[PDB]
């Protein structure tokens, strides 16, 4: 795990029945907890749904970890790890995502599946009224021997309201790795730049373990 690492991913997905493919490439500083990704829709454009629903699915390897908090994620390499996430929105829109993360030299590779079902056609997701995720805190803990992560997420809407989502995530090393103690991860995520239909998106994350 170098101080600078490359990223390449492919996301294959469906949302309210609409198929889509998105590729990305970027770079980040795993030990500083930061990363930039450039994302390009290559199938299914123009997305007819809020792009924010995808952003946290586009690698906890990019987290700055104190010396005294066991860094599980960096330690799953070179072999890698996979995670799984359900995302339950306050309006019964539901998405699941699975990511399989591997490594070749200085580059991570993500193989990502994303599915969203039952979004109200007049809801803020299908109408694209989302502005951004609020900074958040993921609770990392262990249950029946698996590393878990829970976070109550808030998407800010046009007009200043929030639309909540409950994230539950499971993280599993390819080759057994000693589980860390409970802790927390503070997250900020931001779309730095996008074209008109979000065909091209630059996306930034900053995450620190506490």
The CATH number given to whatever domain includes residue 153 is 2.40.155.10
Do residues 137 and 34 touch, judged by C-beta distance below 8 A?
A: no
The CA distance from 47 to 128, in Å, is: 10
Q: What angle do CA 115, 119, 124 make, to 5 degrees?
A: 115
Q: What's the domain range around 95?
A: 1-210
Residues 6 or more apart from 11 whose CB is under 8 A from it? Answer: 20, 21, 22, 23, 24, 54, 57, 58, 110, 112, 113, 114
**42 Cβ contact partners less than 8 Å away, ≥ 6 residues apart:** 21, 22, 23
Cis upstream peptide for 50 (omega within 30°): no
Q: Which residues are bridge partners to 130 per DSSP?
A: 157
Tokens 């072999």 correspond to 79
DSSP state of 92: S
CA dihedral 169, 20, 24, 90 (to 10 degrees): -30
Residues in the chain: 210
Map residue 76 onto helix, strand or coil: helix
Do residues 116 and 95 make contact, with C-beta atoms less than 8 angstroms apart? yes
Strands (DSSP E) contained in 106-145 are: 107-117, 130-133, 136-143
Number of domains the chain is built from: 1
């Amino acid at each position: 795990i170098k101080p600078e690492m490359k990223i390449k991913l492919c996301m294959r997905g469906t949302v309210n029945g609409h198929n889509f493919v998105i590729e990305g490439e970027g770079k980040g500083n795993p030990y500083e907890g930061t990363q930039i990704l450039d994302l390009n829709v290559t199938e299914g454009a123009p997305l007819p749904f809020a792009y924010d629903i995808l952003t946290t699915v586009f690698n906890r390897a990019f987290t700055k970890y104190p010396a005294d908090i066991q860094d599980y994620f960096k330690q799953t390499f070179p072999e890698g790890y996979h995670w799984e996430r359900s995302m339950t929105y306050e309006d019964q829109g539901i998405c699941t995502a699975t990511s399989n993360i591997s490594m070749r030299g200085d580059c991570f590779f993500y193989d990502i599946r994303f599915d969203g079902t039952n979004f109200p056609p007049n809801g803020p997701v299908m109408q694209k009224k989302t502005l951004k995720w609020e900074p958040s805190t993921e609770k990392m803990y262990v249950e029946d021997g698996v590393l878990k992560g829970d976070v109550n997420m808030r998407l800010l809407l046009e007009g200043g309201g929030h639309y909540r989502c409950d994230f539950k995530t499971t993280y599993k090393a390819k080759k057994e790795v000693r589980l860390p103690d409970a802790h927390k991860i503070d997250h900020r995520i931001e779309i730095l730049k996008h074209d008109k239909d979000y065909n091209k998106v630059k996306l930034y994350e900053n995450a620190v373990a506490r």
